[PDB]
Amino acid sequence: SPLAIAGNRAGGSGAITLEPFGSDNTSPELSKLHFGETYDHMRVLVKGYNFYKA
Amino acid sequence: SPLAIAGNRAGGSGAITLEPFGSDNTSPELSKLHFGETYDHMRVLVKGYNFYKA
Amino acid sequence: AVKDTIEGNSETLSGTHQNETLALYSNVDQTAVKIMSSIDPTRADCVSNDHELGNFLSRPVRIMRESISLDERTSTTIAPWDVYLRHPMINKKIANYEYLRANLVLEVVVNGGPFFYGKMLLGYTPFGYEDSLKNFNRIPIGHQNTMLSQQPHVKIDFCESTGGVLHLPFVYNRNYMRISEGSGEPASMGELRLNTLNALKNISFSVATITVFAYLDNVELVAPSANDPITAQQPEL
Amino acid sequence: AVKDTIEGNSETLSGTHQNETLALYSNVDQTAVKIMSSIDPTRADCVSNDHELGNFLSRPVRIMRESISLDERTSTTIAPWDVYLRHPMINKKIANYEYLRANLVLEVVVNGGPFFYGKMLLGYTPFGYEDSLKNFNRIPIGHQNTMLSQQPHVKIDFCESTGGVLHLPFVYNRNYMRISEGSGEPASMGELRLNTLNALKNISFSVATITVFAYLDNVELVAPSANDPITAQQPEL
Amino acid sequence: HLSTFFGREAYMDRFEWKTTDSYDTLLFYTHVHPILFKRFEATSGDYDVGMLLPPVGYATIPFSFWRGGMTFRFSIVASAFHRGRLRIVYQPQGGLGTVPGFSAAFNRVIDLGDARDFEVTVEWNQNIAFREVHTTGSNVPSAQYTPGLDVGRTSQLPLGDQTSVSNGVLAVYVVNDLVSPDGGTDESVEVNWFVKGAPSFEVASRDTKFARWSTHWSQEEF
Amino acid sequence: HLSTFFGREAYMDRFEWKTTDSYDTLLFYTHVHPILFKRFEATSGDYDVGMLLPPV
């Protein structure tokens, strides 16, 4: 019953990890292969201009 | 009678202080919270342009 | 990556805690989502150090006010403990307690010109005065002043405008006094007398005023209860 | 010879003093009769360290109570800040102040057997919810649970009897909130939603209960005023 | 520097005491904000109007938001044989439609003896950081304070409802009746008050409300 | 930061088990991509439609 209570907190921090599908293998030099730069920050993205309401 | 003469000079420098309403508590970083900058000097303010008399 | 700020504050607590009036006991575990507040040094603007909740019973309250006429001898009495605790403002902050223990502080304010030359007496009688109250009211004012002058009192001078500060202790045969509804204990702890010593005159070629305040100090409130206090009443004058 | 205990305590004071709310100024001298009290270590019997006046707003109060029936999906909402500050017991201790600033603490208590296996959701919406309130009530309960799961919430399990603790911060575009009469600020600081996640069932061979408490912590009362507070009201359930 | 305007005192008006006054009567009532107008009507022979402001009120016109403390000074004009006691009450918000207590709100009791000319400063006691600045739509502004003998206004009733531009309300009540040697029913006493700005005064905005006013009031009626 | 959107959980839907089920029966099937819509129809009295998406 302890295992059923700890697995009920918000956010799913009591869930059982289940040996995930495959592995994660990404190199740092993937941006130099695709798209040139990264898009991980929305604060930088919002500084571009957009057409609106003539 | 001395207390009635000293309290009659111009500017009200002989008045009796009366334990003011509340206290003064302002932080230096209030301009960074509101309006960005300060407006304490009229010499700087007068260097802006104003429309006048076409 | 940043904190999830929902499932980064979750944690599990025991089902037992206390809040100085309600205690809960359980054996199963709980879940907590504790989102903390910020420091914000700029969020404290109207911050003083006089108005509080602990020091609320030390707030002065006007309990007496009279106007004095020329060539008259009178007598008037009130109950200081009963009037102060029954004030509508004070009654709200003593509403879920049973017992009280504090000291009385009285203060008088007089205002008269240099043309009046009158005098008055203000005396106090401690606990036990209700027994000899039907007979003390039958004594002439002049003879009453003889006994009042031997008790904690103050003299009011009308030629000047001065007088009046009285610190009184808590005298009682019990540890505290019951302030719940139906109590008569507050109305039996003391008495204030205000009678003429010398009649007021005037140098011609006609009315003076007087005001009395009261409050408490070293207040102790104990015994929480779900009982209403004494029925509030506005001071008569 | 001993002290006269009447004219042995007399002394003269200045006519200027302060009591954190009333300050008096005068230039004439006064007279004082200060009779001090005793130590009396045996006079303190009903002395605890939980009931106070400063820590009075940290007293839990029941604001919600429901009974759950089998095979039904429902939704119910209240206003936690408005209900707590409007309680008759709490309204008395906030009566001559104008502004308040404190954090909300909620707690849920559940009771169900091992034969029930139901689930429920309880979510909170911060300041600004009144604008989107007429439209949020038009969304189906299933789709409402999607958005509530991303906000500070708690999950109620009926197979066990557990869950419910929620600490919430003070979020507001001003420094404090006005608690005087006619104020609508307390009724706009937050909202509590209680809707079904999974319908309650039972293993046969029919009603559960739930209770929610609330209180405040780090309370700050400022701006004394002679203004009545919001009209008190007993909680609806 | 703008500090030279916030700190220059100015006489505003007068009100009476009228010794035939009960123990609790309103004598003065005002809003705590720097924009207090005074309208005159060109005593000499013509028809002309004008308005005046204190040095604190004048400097905050080209701005839209204000905050800080303000200083008030009351001076009683009486002889050496006058005795009495007065009260000063401050209400942070809502106004005083009825006589308050003695400790529910901030109170001060001062006595008319050998000392006069009391001064007091009110600090910022709002839940918001900044307030608005008052304007006028016509040439006859609404009353901002109760009786002022210079402007020919003598109503002692409390006005109100200016919460969005002010920092509370000031009121003056009697405590002990005024005593004079000769005899009442014909004797009064006048009190003069001055306004100023505390060293914590502040303005931060830019506004265009004074764009069509003018300092040339001399001949504009024809 | 965009990381605050990738990492916020969300309840989507429910499916049943129905104990009267054989030993090999399909109970759930989905596509592994973040664009999963949910359409509602304004329970209260009017005609309105809407859609919802997870934070991702």
Numbering used by the authors:
A (entry chain A), B (entry chain A): 625 to 678
C (entry chain B), D (entry chain B): 34 to 238, 244 to 275
E (entry chain C): 388 to 609
F (entry chain C): 388 to 443
Give the text the authors published on this PDB structure.
For CsfrRNAV full particles, residues A34–L275 were modeled for VP2, C332–F609 were modeled for VP3, and S625–L894 were modeled for VP1. Every two VP2s form a dimer, and together with VP3, each dimer of VP2 and VP3 builds a 3-fold. The amino acid sequence of the VP4 region is present, but its structure is absent within the CsfrRNAV capsid. Thus, the VP4 is seemingly not an essential factor for virus transmission in CsfrRNAV. The full particles are more homogeneous and thus have fewer conformational variabilities. The overall full and empty capsid features are similar, except that the 3-fold structures built with VP2s and VP3s are more densely and tightly assembled in the full capsid. The VP2 N-terminal extension is visible only in the full capsid, indicating that this extension is probably important for particle stabilization, genome recruitment, and genome packaging.
Marnaviridae viruses are abundant algal viruses that regulate the dynamics of algal blooms in aquatic environments. Similar to the icosahedral capsid of the Picornaviridae viruses, that of the Marnaviridae viruses adapts a common pseudo-T = 3 symmetry with a conserved jelly-roll structural fold. The structural diversity of the Marnaviridae viruses that infect different algae hosts will be a key to understanding their host-specific transmission.
